[PDB]
Amino acid sequence: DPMVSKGEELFTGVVPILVELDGDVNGHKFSVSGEGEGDATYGKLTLKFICTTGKLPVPWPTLVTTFLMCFARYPDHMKQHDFFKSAMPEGYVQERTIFFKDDGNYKTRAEVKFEGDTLVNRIELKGIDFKEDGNILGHKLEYNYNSHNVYIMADKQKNGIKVNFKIRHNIEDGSVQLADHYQQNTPIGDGPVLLPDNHYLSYQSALSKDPNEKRDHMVLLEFVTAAGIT
């Protein structure tokens, strides 16, 4: 399929990645830079993020979703449902509202696209209505991350997709902070895109620290595999 071919030819090997985020949560301003690489053959991403403005005013785990679904491994039987690669190289827009149960919300807008051989994720994040002493602004969230399925459906009328899912972040008292994600993606280009049957992406995410890094940062390892269309 010459369409399926165009995304294979873009993602076949290891692709360098750059991430840039500008944040404002309750007027707490911050900037994060990320670098690393994806290998969609293995559904694999390796990234390191640095808060370049000092202390990150929110927990790192709250940002993991915001900080690359074009790097999903879609099994061979499922290549015709891979919207994300299909939008490339022109890229797509990923928008979210993320409602933290009993606390504030994030509204995110991202542009995911190639800048030459580099896959780039440019993000703006605005957070509003947080409790200065809640789980988020009071940094009560554990530095860890659970596995989660993410459910994709077409949004035919917008030539794109909608994605809905919940993340439960562990609190340090042993309870969980719910983070209910609503998402929409739309291609940046005017060309055809692959619009998927309902399926899901399975995520595993491991958070770590770079022993020689003094800035406030996060090392993120993610594996992402499409499923749910046998």
Curated annotation (Swiss-Prot):
User: Native species of this protein?
Assistant: Aequorea victoria
Q: Which gene encodes it?
A: GFP
Outcome recorded upon mutating V176A:
In mut2.1; shifts fluorescence lifetime from 3.03 to 2.50 ns
Protein name, per record: Green fluorescent protein
Looking up InterPro entries in the UniProt record yields: GFP, GFP-related, Green_fluorescent_prot
Q: Report the outcome of F67L.
A: In EGFP; increases fluorescence at warmer temperatures such as 37 degrees Celsius. In EBFP; gives rise to variants with blue fluorescence
**How changing Y145H affects the protein?**
In mut1.3; shifts fluorescence lifetime from 3.03 to 2.78 ns. In mut1.5; shifts fluorescence lifetime from 3.03 to 2.72 ns. In mut1.27; shifts fluorescence lifetime from 3.03 to 2.85 ns
Tissue expression profile of the protein: Photocytes.
Biotechnology and industry use: Green fluorescent protein has been engineered to produce a vast number of variously colored mutants, fusion proteins, and biosensors. Further generation of mutants led to more stable proteins (at 37 degrees Celsius for example) with brighter fluorescence and longer fluorescence lifetimes.
User: Changing N198S does what?
Assistant: In EBFP1.2; shifts the excitation and emission spectra to shorter wavelengths and increases quantum yields compared to BFP
Subunit comment for this entry? Monomer.
Q: What effect is documented for mutating K162Q?
A: In R10-3; matures to the red-emitting state with excitation and emission maxima at 555 and 585 nm, respectively
